[PDB]
Symmetry: D3
Subunit: 308 residues, 6 copies
């Protein structure tokens, strides 16, 4: 009844998830046309199946989004019983508000486009804003890296019982507090004004920078400098989504981090060759379990504060 498909050829995560469910990845014939439009062909009857499409890590976001939609489309008109998208890193998630400007809420637009395409259910990890669930009318299971993050912290940072959980921006207040309270440790908060301000004691402690995503890495670098200027022993940075476009690898390789930790919601294998500070958590068991629970009607909640 359950059928999984991948997007494009960045199929590592999808095949990882497949393996763990004891399934092969469903057959697809997906190619860009000479004019840059995307062809998609579903190479096996999905008629009355519980279909799952895992979003690609290609990098190119619009080519990835049209492909994801077109697949959703193909699968619905082919009489799939239900189409879930496993979208580890939700596109345009940083565009969730107008910000006093005459701007689009592209997070919502995308939310609509997934919905018209024929999506029935959404599985994602760590939405940039919690409220992005509210841009949909269908159900959304937003999973957390937070328990595996806690796992990583405890098994890898000797001084985790005496660290500080810092936010690189004001927006990520709740996220860093929540982790600190569970770890029973202090928290601190960097805000940018062309200068950063730090509130909270970090002196003679290990500072851990927690964010949901890092893109160009300009911020976290400037934030690790600040933390080492205010007397932190050493600095870690943990991001659930490792986007790392442009000068990120350069900014990191130079930057005064001990380690940079990301999940494989985005492909890292290529970035890891050129950057020796990047460690990768595998989140495929979390995504696999989510699908598995979903298909059975078992509680996907048990993953919000437990590592399968």
């Amino acid at each position: 009844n359950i059928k999984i498909f991948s997007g494009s050829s960045h199929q590592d995560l999808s095949q990882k998830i497949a393996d763990r469910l004891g399934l092969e990845l469903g057959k697809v014939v997906t190619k860009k046309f000479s004019n840059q439009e995307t062809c998609v062909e579903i190479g096996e009857s999905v008629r009355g199946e519980d279909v799952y499409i895992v979003q690609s890590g290609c990098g190119e976001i619009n080519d990835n989004l049209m492909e994801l939609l077109i697949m959703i489309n193909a699968c619905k008109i082919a009489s799939a019983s239900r189409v879930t998208t496993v979208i580890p890193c939700f596109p345009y998630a940083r565009q969730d508000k107008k910000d006093k400007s005459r701007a689009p809420i592209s997070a919502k637009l995308v939310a609509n486009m997934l919905s018209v395409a024929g999506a029935d259910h959404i599985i994602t990890m760590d939405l940039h804003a919690s409220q992005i669930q509210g841009f949909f009318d269908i159900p959304v299971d937003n999973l957390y890296a937070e328990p595996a993050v806690l796992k990583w912290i405890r098994e890898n940072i000797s001084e985790w019982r005496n660290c500080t959980i810092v936010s690189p921006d004001a927006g990520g207040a709740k996220r860093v507090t929540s982790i600190a309270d569970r770890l029973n440790v202090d928290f601190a908060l960097i805000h940018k004004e062309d200068r950063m301000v730090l509130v909270g004691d970090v002196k003679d402690r290990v500072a851990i920078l927690v964010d949901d995503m890092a893109d160009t890495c300009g911020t976290i670098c400037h934030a690790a400098d600040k933390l080492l200027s205010a007397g932190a022993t050493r600095v870690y940075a943990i991001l659930t989504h490792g986007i790392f476009s442009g000068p990120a690898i350069s900014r990191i390789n130079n930057a005064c981090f001990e380690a940079v930790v990301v999940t494989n919601t985005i492909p890292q294998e290529d970035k890891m060759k050129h950057c020796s500070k990047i460690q990768v958590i595998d989140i495929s068991m979390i995504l696999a379990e989510a699908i598995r629970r979903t298909h059975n009607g078992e509680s996907v909640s048990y993953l919000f504060s437990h590592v399968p």
Copy 2:
């Protein structure tokens, strides 16, 4: 061509809004049946009209929301050209995420109901979350108390050029940092562990607690003590939405608040009498302007 309608009782804000525009509020027959139902009769023809309903303050949010939806409805089936709802304080607005629970996103449910009721356009002020603008597919105009708050602060706090703007929770980091940045002064945050924790420098300076809304004031009155214990010279509390239910009023007088400032997005005339330090910024002109500018095709965002 324009018509302005009010809510249950709570006419003051509306009456004010209709004044600044030089109109009289529209004829309506709102009442409650003996069995808790909400009864509505539109006392004039709204056919082909640009209508504006201003949300009431009966201090009963389900009754008020229902009356609001029943109005939009009567208007939409009486061939009104358009129905904007002026809801300065958006109902169920803190219920905008599951938060790891199996809980409703009620502000989405509410957005969806206003939508299906026939509301074409929304006007509100300081939405608890900015994202509860993406709950709608109809356009929303969200006004800010931010400029009126600033003006007041400068014109009312002698030491402001050395004051600290303080968030009562962690979830209020962005709102305060903004206010602190415009004023070019320090910011500080408080978090409930319970035991309260304060990050930021508040020693020997005027503290200004800033929240979008206070309900019980429990959190903000604690926030005040913690701030005194921290050695704040004088603590102030600014709130855009003053809900003040339960123990709220008494809790304030029992606190050290030099003053408490709110905008009349909710009727305070009752609670003012029971509280001396309360002070109100009048936001009607801002709502009236946004009504005219919407109607005229004039730039609303300027008021931001």
Copy 3:
């Protein structure tokens, strides 16, 4: 697969229905906030379940309606397979038309709000207007008290073979005729102009007043007076929905009824202490069977003219 929930704390009817299906009521954490908004929390995974929400008898209709919706909402985004509302007494049902006025069709509005909230199916009893089914696009099973009413009449009114079934208003013509024809007895019809007019013979017979709902009871009282003025032996009044707000208890206790019969679509236990003329039919087996049939795909029709 089947899960039942109640609304608010008026849980008598809901637990009655639960008992009869051999189920416990699903766990909910429901409280009004200090500002009068309603919190709701579903205290157990409903993921892929056939959920049923039975509408509360609290009395306060708007607080009851938001709560019902919010629950519907919580349950849908929590991936319930299907959400049915068992709404014994449909709110705003008397507002089903404009009545030559510039008024809302609040019955339809409510019908829409249930529908956007995420309702998939509706189970109700004795809609004020049959056409209220037409305010929905989803399926609606409108059940009747009429067979149990007939049961009550036959077992409780000795002279039922020689009674008259009277309508308190013109609107309820079809309802009273239908009962009379099945009982093979006469019918009569009261209309209000500030005076009532009666058409149909009632002289030296037992008059039974049949309505779907009574609220303040002003009408039926004035209608029992009329009936006793036109020579009816004694007067009964049977209403499916016992609303009884305001002076109803006072109007009844004084009023010249032999008995007032209501179903427990609305709580009566409190009203029954202060009013000794109120008898209560239990309709929980009818509602239980309806749910039971629904969940199985058995014919809910068999209840329209049979008492389970």
Copy 4:
């Protein structure tokens, strides 16, 4: 800015409506293909126009409904600003409840089709059920023959101040009681057990059978006998919708009807010739007024 279009053939009512407004009916090319399909060509540009389609009377309701939907459609995709449908007699209108059967609610299906066809606004007369206004989410304006019926009665029944208004079924209680109340006279109801039963006092007075529509007239012609047997001085039958199919016409002449009054919501010019006593109230001015007032933003409800 306004454009009025007609139906299949059945132009009379439309032509009349367009006259009272001083316009010419719009150019169209409505026909039937040899294989029962309905063909439509809008013979002019309706781009940006407030359009009005007046429902035909080919005495084929499925054909007519389809032609109506195909018109609304062609109009909506040819960029017409708005499409009101003038359907004096709403199709499938008695199919507004299951009635304990597993039957369709077809008037809801029909409402839904007009809706999805692109109709923005409805204008109809004496809806069989008032509730079939809540079938739509677009606004509906329902006109009443009630005032034209009354006027006629007073001006045509000598004894009216002592007459009885009689419902042919139980389901017609509300409509007659209303008419009886305005006239301040007696009301009486009939119910088919079959054997007919009469409740109300009709002895030695003029009886007036009032229904919204008659189809076979079977029920109403019986109703007439029962009323004579009851000792009615003279029986009359008023109907807002005169459908008169099957045996209807002959059944009337075979009855004792002093006269039978209908409104030209349906073409009667054919059936009149075969029936002497039939008399028509002309409701075009009422439809024309409601068209102008809708267009102008003028108060339509006054016509109620």
Copy 5:
């Protein structure tokens, strides 16, 4: 779980399909009212069933379409689990475009009306335009006569290895080429300007006229004349839909065809008495299998190029 119903009394095809699935046709009470509106009553609980409505061959298209819709409606509000319409010949299918005119896309309108009525899935055969699938948002299985056509051609035309597959119009280019290529034979193309032009060699070969539908038969007749004027041995005409309104029977009986082949997507029994050139392919096994596959989640594709 599976329930089939017919439309009107033209029940031959529906009962043929029923027989083959080993089912009786579901009970319906369907009659036109005196005013020409259609009554429909579903004479047995379809609650939670997989319902199938096969479209009538009455001839009268609007009376057939309202009836089909009303049935769809009745079935949805009666809580059918899913409503499929088996619409062998899709109504208004020739009205799929504006054609440089201020005209309706009545194919789309119909597509919408089926969709609002409550249709969940569509099963049809040989849409006039492939793109008619795109007028729906629900799934559509468009089946082909083409494999059975190929079957008929091979078993009935001795010279099929040396024939020409001709199009009566320009629109039907792709259709005729595809058949010719599979049969490895030549193709030709008639276009109308008040004169027809033929492109492609037909000389001393058997010409087969292939169209999807023939209505009045004016075209194909004038096209068989042309083909015999350009030296074709004998002419066949194969149409999937035999509409044959008006002078068709007369035009055919006179016309120089060897044979006229139609499927029973439309009733033929009556036309066959008066016209001896009409042969009928039975397509009920193709439709039966389609339903059968649909209900099971088996691949309906296997019928696109195979004859069950």
Copy 6:
């Protein structure tokens, strides 16, 4: 009251369109973030305005489509009165049928996205399929290059009164027969078996290959050889949409094409330099006229 906005870069067509109407293109801030996202800022107030977005030509169709949807969106939530999208060349337009595969109908998916994005009205040119007008429920106006193609042919092919209009596929029968009929000349079709097959008389006459679009030009360059081998005097190729990706440009110069004519529905200024024989019909006036006539309520279809 009108406002015209452009796409990514590809301003030429827009700039031209805004010229012929006497307006300046609207202020926007379109860019790409370093991580492939599309960023948009509407540089002015579109509140209550009839807006027109003209689709870009960055030669990246997913990027371009997304930027287009993000624009429509920003416009719709900034209270613009209406949003027409001028998409001369409709994206994913050949993906309008499954074609016996389990493939997407992407042009329906695309129609659905433009729709849900908030687009109220579409203007396009020579849709690959006429039916991809029924993909929308909002009205579409489809312009034809047909008259500009004809005019050019007559005014550029000396022998045209004895020429043959040739389809490169079987699926192009209707489009060519039409063109051949207006010109009152012969038509001929080609089909790929592969081996190419030609039906129609092209011997000793000028051949004109006519397609709606060419992408690789592979098919059309073969089509050209087959036509020479058939004894065509001079072959021409007219295309309404010149996509010319991959080997296209080189394939043309390597072919015998006397000339290749395209409309600037796509920027050709780059590919022209690399190809001498390419010639462009300027369709801006036709798009500008259709923009004004839409706005004014003026007859657009005349331009057909």
